[PDB]
Short mmCIF file of C-alpha atoms in Angstrom, two decimals:
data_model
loop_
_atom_site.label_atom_id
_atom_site.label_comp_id
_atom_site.label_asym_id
_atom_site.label_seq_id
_atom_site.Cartn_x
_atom_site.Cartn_y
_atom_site.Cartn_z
CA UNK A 1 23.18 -9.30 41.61
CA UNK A 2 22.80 -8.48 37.85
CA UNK A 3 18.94 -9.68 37.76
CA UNK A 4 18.78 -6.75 40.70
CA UNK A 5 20.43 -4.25 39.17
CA UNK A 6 18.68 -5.15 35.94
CA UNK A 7 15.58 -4.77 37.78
CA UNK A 8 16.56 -1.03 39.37
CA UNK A 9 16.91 0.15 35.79
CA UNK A 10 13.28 -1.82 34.65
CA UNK A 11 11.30 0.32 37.33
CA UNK A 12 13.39 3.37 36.42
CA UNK A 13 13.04 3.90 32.92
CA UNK A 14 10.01 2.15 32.41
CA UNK A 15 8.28 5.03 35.60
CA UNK A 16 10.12 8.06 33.47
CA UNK A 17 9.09 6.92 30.04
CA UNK A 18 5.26 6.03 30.95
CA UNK A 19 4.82 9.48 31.32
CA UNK A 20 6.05 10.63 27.54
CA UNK A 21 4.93 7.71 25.88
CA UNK A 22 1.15 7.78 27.37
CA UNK A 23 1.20 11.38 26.29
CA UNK A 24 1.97 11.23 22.72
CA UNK A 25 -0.34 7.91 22.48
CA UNK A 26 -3.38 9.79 24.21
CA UNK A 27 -2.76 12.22 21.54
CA UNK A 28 -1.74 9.88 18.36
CA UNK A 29 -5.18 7.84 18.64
CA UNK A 30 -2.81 4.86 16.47
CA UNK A 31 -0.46 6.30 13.72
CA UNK A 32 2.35 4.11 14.11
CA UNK A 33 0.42 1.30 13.55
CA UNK A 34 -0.11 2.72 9.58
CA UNK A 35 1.95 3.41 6.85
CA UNK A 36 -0.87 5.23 5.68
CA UNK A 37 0.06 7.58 7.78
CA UNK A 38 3.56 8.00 10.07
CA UNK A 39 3.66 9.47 12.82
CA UNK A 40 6.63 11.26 14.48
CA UNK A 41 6.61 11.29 17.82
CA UNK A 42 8.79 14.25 19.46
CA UNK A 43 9.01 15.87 22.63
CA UNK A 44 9.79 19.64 22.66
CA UNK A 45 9.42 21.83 25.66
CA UNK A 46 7.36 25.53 24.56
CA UNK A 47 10.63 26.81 24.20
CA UNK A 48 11.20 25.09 21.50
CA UNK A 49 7.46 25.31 20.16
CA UNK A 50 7.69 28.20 18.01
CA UNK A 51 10.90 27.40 16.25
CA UNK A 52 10.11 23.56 15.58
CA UNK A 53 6.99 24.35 14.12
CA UNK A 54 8.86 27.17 12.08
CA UNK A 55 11.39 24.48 10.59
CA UNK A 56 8.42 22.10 10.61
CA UNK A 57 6.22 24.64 8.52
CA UNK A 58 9.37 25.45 6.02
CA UNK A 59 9.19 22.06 4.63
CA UNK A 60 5.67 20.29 5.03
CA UNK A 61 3.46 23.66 4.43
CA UNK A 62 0.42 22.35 6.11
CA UNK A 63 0.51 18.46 4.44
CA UNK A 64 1.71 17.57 8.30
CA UNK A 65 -0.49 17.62 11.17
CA UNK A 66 1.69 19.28 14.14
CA UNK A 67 -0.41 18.32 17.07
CA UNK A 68 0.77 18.49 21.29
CA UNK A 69 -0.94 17.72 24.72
CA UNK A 70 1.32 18.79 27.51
CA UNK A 71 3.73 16.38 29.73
CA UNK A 72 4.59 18.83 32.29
CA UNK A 73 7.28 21.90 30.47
CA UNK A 74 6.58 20.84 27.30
CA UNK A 75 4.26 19.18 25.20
CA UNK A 76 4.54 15.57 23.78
CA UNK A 77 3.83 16.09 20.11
CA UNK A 78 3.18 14.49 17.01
CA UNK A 79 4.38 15.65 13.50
CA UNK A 80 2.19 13.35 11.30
CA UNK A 81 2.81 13.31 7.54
CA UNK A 82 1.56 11.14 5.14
CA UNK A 83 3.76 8.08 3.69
CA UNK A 84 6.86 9.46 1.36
CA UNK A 85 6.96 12.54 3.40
CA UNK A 86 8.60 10.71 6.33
CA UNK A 87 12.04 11.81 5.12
CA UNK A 88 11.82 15.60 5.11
CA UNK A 89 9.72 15.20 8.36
CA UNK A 90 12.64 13.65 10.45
CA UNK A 91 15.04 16.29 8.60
CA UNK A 92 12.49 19.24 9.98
CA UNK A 93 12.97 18.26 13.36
CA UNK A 94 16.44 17.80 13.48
CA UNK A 95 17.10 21.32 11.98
CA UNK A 96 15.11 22.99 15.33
CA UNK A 97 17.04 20.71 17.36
CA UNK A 98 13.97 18.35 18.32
CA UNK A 99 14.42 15.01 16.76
CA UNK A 100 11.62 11.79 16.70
CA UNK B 1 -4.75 16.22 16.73
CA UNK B 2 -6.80 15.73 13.56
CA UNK B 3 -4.88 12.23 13.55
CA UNK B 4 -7.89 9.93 14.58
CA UNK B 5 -9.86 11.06 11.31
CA UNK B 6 -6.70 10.49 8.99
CA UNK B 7 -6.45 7.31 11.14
CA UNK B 8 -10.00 5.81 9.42
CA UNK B 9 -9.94 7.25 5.85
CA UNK B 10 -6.79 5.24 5.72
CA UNK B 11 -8.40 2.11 6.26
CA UNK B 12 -11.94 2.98 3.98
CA UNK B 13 -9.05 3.39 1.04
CA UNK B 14 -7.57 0.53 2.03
CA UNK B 15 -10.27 -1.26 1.41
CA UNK B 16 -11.71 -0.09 -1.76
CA UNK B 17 -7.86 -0.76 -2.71
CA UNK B 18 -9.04 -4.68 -1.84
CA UNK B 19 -11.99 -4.99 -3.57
CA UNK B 20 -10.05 -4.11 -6.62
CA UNK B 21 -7.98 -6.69 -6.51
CA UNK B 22 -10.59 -9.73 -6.23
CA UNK B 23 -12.43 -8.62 -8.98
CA UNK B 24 -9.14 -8.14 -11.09
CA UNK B 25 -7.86 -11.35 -10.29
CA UNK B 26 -11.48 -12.70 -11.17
CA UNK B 27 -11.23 -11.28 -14.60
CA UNK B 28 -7.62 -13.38 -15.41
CA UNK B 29 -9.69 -16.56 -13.85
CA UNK B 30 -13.19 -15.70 -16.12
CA UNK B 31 -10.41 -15.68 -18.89
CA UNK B 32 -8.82 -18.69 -17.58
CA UNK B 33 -12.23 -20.40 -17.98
CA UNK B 34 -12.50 -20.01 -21.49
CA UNK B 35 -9.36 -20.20 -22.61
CA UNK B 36 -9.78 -23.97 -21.46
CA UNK B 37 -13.19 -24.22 -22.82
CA UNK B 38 -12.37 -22.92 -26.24
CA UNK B 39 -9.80 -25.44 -26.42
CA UNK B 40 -11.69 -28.07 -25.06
CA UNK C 1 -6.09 17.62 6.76
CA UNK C 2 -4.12 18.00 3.15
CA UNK C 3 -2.66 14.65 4.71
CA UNK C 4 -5.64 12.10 3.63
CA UNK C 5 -6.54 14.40 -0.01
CA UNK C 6 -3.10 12.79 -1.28
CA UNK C 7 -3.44 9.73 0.26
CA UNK C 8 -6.97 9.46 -1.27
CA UNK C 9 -5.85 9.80 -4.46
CA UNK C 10 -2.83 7.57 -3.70
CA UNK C 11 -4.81 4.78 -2.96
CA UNK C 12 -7.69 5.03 -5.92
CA UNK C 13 -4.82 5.24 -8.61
CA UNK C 14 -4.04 1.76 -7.83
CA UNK C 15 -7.67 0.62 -7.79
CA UNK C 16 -7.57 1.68 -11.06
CA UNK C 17 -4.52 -0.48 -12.05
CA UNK C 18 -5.67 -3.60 -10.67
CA UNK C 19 -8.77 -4.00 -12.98
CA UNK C 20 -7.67 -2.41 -15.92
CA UNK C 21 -4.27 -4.68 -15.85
CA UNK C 22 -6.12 -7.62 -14.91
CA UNK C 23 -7.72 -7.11 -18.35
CA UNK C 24 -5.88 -6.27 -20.50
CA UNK C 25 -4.08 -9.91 -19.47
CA UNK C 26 -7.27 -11.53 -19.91
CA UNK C 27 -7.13 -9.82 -23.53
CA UNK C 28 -3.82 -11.16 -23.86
CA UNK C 29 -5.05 -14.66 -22.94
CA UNK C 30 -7.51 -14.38 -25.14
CA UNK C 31 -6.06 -13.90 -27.98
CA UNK C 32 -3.94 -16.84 -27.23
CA UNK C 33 -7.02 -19.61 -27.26
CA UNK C 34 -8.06 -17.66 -30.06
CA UNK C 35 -5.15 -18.24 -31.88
CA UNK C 36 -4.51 -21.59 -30.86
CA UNK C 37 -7.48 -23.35 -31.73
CA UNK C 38 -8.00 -21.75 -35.24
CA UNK C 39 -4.40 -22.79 -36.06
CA UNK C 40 -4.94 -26.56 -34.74
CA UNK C 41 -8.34 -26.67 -36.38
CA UNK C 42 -6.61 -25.86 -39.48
CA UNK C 43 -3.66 -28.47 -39.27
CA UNK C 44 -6.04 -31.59 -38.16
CA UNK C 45 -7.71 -31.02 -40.86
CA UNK C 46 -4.88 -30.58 -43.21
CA UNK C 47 -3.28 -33.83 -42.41
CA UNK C 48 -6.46 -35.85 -42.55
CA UNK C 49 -7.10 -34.64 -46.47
CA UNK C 50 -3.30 -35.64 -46.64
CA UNK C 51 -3.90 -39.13 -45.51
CA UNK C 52 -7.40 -39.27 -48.18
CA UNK C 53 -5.51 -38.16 -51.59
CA UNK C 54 -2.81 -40.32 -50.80
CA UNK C 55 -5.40 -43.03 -49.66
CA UNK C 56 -7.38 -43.42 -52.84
CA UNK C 57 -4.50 -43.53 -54.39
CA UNK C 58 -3.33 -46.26 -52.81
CA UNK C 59 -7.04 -47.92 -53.52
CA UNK C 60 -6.68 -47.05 -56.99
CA UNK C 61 -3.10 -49.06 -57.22
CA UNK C 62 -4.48 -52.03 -55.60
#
């Protein structure tokens, strides 16, 4: 009964997420992989676009690649910055609203 | 994005960051070397 | 992007340290044979012309 119900949940999640997830990895060609580089992966929907990349803008400038492909009313995206700017990058996001 | 291009330079880097360190750890050992021959 | 510039010059600046340190040690090691072998070839001798003054004289009361 709980290997079942376990189970429901697998399929469900696992069908809702493979759309997001292949969306921002299509995009993030491996980012997470180096501490070169982070990567942030966020969804936003174009709603959001304008004012996530404003608060995104404020603090990295243009040392942060912003970067979306679509996953159907919004756009995965990537905020990518560079290793020691991980901390205002997550702070951006949250600010708009979006979050990694 | 960009991303795939700042996902090779980071390795090139990487790797010029490696090739530092054998040939600094080679200088201690060429050292090493004749420290014990001078000795010797 | 502005992304790989700094991480370019990230990466070289320890290039740089890993040479120049690993030198700078071997100078340091260095200077410790250096040391140690011109104070030990000093002090073998020493005792030996010790153990020759004394010896003769010891010749020379027989």
């Amino acid at each position: 009964t709980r290997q079942k119900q376990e189970l429901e949940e697998e399929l469900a999640l696992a069908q809702a997420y493979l759309e997001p997830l292949e969306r921002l990895a299509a995009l993030a060609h491996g980012l997470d992989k180096s501490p070169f580089l982070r990567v942030i992966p966020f969804l936003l929907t174009e709603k959001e676009l304008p004012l996530v990349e404003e608060a995104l803008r404020k603090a990295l400038e243009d040392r942060y690649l912003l970067a979306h492909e679509a996953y159907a009313g919004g756009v995965a995206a990537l905020v990518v910055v560079h290793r020691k700017e991980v901390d205002q990058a997550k702070a951006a996001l949250s600010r708009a609203g979006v979050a990694e | 994005g960009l991303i795939k291009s700042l996902a090779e330079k980071e390795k090139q880097l990487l790797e010029r960051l490696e090739a530092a360190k054998k040939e600094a750890e080679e200088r201690v050992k060429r050292a090493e070397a004749e420290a014990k021959a001078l000795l010797e | 992007s502005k992304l790989e510039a700094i991480l370019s010059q990230e990466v070289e600046a320890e290039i740089q340290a890993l040479l120049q340190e690993a030198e700078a040690k071997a100078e340091a090691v260095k200077r410790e044979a250096e040391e140690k072998a011109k104070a030990l070839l000093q002090a073998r001798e020493r005792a030996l012309e010790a153990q020759y003054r004394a010896a003769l004289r010891r010749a020379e009361s027989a």
